[PDB]
Amino acid sequence: APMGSDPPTACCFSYTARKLPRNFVVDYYETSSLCSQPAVVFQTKRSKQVCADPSESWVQEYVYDLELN
Template sequence: MRALALLLLCVFGSTLVSFTVADSGIGADSCCFRYYERQVQFTKIRSYELTNERCSQPAVILQTTRNVRICVDPEAAWVQSAMTRLDQRNS
């Protein structure tokens, strides 16, 4: 009986630890699941960030001058051009 109680306590403890670790996970903060289809004017873009490689879809998140975050396709020519111009402006 004592062994069964100890076994149940161990199972319960390991379950609790796994939930705690999963809840505080080290996952990606921002992922995009679809792209904004239209081109954003460069003058309205303040900054950009790349999504984490753990996201299911690669994307660039543009931060606009009005603090709106927009997910765009990193392969689009206008996005690559905007990132290059922002990098040059900030260096």
């Protein structure tokens, strides 16, 4: 059926500059795909969501910890 048209896309334009302490990341969220530059988004406690360069190994590590417990 006629699906949506072509809305924008929540793509990160940059990233923070400090690794969020595990005590500051209760969850996370990934970007879209349309834009050729997706990224991982960490959800904290006194903020909302923070973009993170997947190129930083610590980002992949925190994601793994979130996949576990």
